[PDB]
């Protein structure tokens, strides 16, 4: 379908960005939209092949976009504001009568330092042996904690194999520090299994999360580690008891 | 221009009614459905001038005076769980198939919990953290979970976890915190909790 890169973006405020959108195949409408966190998706322009027939959602001359030869698109915004944060979206349909059919977005996350952005650190919390005496249930919770911006993928890998079956994620990073603007955020996960599958020590738990931070391009000049794109993991072997 | 309720409810298996108000519609105009998934980019649902337009999904309903319109979900199931968009587009003039977005209606769709087994646990400590979890799980769908009245505790909403190979569902949150009064048995204070709750001891 239409895809869209980057998928995850964090900029210093007053830096240019560049969005991309390859839409479908044939599809001669593109539609752009910035949708803030909570709220539905805004529009801000569309393009007919190339012609960009209504660019009325525009919020400012810092937003520019185009789609030179009637396919793929850039939508760039100058000089990005805190303000500017958002999903951007992309859609394209092959006409008027279609229905139109969506890229997965690219989230942005304007901060006044990148000396704001930090990876996540991780921790897995074993089963009660209460809830496996009761249930016959064992729930494992994983937590991450501390990272900015809130671009993170949450996966639960048992034996080196990916599961999704028994897993509860939260649908969204909580902020630790509600009243500070660059707060850090934290994230929680449930992954269950039965207590037979528990109780084996030969099965290996592990929670990762995925951390979508700086690139090679961005400067980093703090005594730190360089807050780069990464996963970090913890791990639980099962338990007899 | 449209407007939706806020929010709705529904438990797995029954069928929803999402309305829509909106100004009374030409016989020409058509309304559309989209919804959101959590984290997902929207989907195209249905779209049609009449009713009796409909799928696998779902049917669209367009009252007899063209001032609202409903779309029906046959049979909700978990997955139907996202914000649902009716829109009205224009047609005819200089119409190219723009789209605009209200805020929706946040569809959550609860699971049948056929036995409540409310409970309370902590769970092991971790050694990298200095954080202490605790479990509230397999509480009834009506049963709510509220914030704490701490800043230094973190509660989430409560979720669900499909264990889809032994077809079971539980309703759960988790809460956290590095504070030495903090204890299992007083996390979920804040939250109106079945009486029968199970503390382990």
């Known amino acids: 379908g239409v895809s869209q890169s980057p998928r995850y973006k964090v900029a210093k405020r007053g830096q240019d960005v560049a969005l991309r959108c390859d839409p479908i195949?044939?599809?001669?409408?593109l539609f752009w939209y910035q949708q803030a966190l909570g709220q539905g998706p805004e529009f801000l322009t569309y393009?007919?092949?190339?012609?960009?027939?209504?660019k009325s959602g525009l919020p400012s001359d810092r937003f520019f976009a185009e789609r030179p030869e009637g396919s793929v698109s850039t939508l760039k915004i100058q000089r990005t504001q805190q303000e500017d944060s958002a999903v951007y979206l992309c859609?394209?349909?092959?006409?008027?009568?279609?229905?139109?059919?969506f890229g997965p977005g690219t989230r942005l996350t304007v901060t006044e330092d990148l000396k704001n952005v930090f990876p996540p650190e991780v921790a897995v919390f074993e089963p009660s042996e209460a809830e496996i005496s009761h249930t016959q249930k064992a729930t494992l919770v994983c937590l991450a904690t501390g990272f900015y911006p809130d671009h993170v993928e949450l996966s639960w890998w048992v034996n080196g194999k990916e599961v999704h079956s028994g897993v509860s994620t939260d649908p969204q990073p909580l902020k630790e520090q509600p009243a500070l603007n660059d707060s850090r955020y934290c994230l929680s996960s449930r992954l269950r299994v039965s207590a037979t599958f528990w109780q084996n020590p030969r099965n290996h738990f592990r929670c990762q999360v995925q951390f979508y931070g700086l690139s090679e391009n961005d400067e980093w000049t703090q005594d730190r580690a360089k807050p780069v794109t990464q996963i970090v993991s913890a791990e639980a072997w099962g338990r007899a008891d | 221009k449209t407007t939706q309720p806020n929010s709705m409810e529904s438990n797995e298996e029954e069928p929803v009614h999402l309305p829509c108000n909106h100004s009374?519609?030409?016989?020409?105009?058509?309304i559309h459905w989209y919804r959101q998934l959590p984290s997902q980019g929207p989907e195209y649902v249905i779209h049609?001038?009449?009713s009796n337009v409909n799928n696998r999904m779902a049917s669209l309903a367009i009252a007899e005076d063209r001032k609202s319109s409903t779309l029906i979900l046959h049979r909700a199931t978990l997955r139907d769980a996202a914000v649902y968009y009716c829109?009205?587009?224009?047609?005819?003039?200089?119409?190219?198939?723009?789209?605009?977005f209200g805020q929706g209606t946040i569809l959550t769709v609860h699971p049948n919990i056929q036995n409540p087994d409310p409970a309370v646990y902590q769970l092991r400590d971790s050694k990298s953290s200095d954080k202490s979890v605790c479990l509230f799980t397999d509480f009834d769908s009506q049963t709510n979970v509220s914030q704490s009245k701490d800043s230094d505790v973190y509660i989430t909403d409560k979720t669900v976890l499909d264990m889809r190979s032994m077809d079971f569902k539980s309703n759960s949150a988790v809460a956290w915190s590095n504070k030495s009064d903090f204890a299992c048995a007083n996390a979920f204070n804040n939250s109106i909790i079945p009486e029968d709750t199970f503390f382990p001891s």
């Open positions: 195949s044939g599809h001669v409408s």
């Open positions: 393009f007919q092949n190339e012609a960009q027939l209504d």
């Open positions: 829109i009205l587009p224009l047609a005819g003039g200089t119409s190219y198939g723009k789209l605009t």
């Open positions: 009374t519609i030409s016989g020409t105009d058509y």
């Open positions: 859609a394209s349909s092959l006409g008027q009568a279609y229905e139109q059919y």
């Open positions: 049609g001038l009449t």
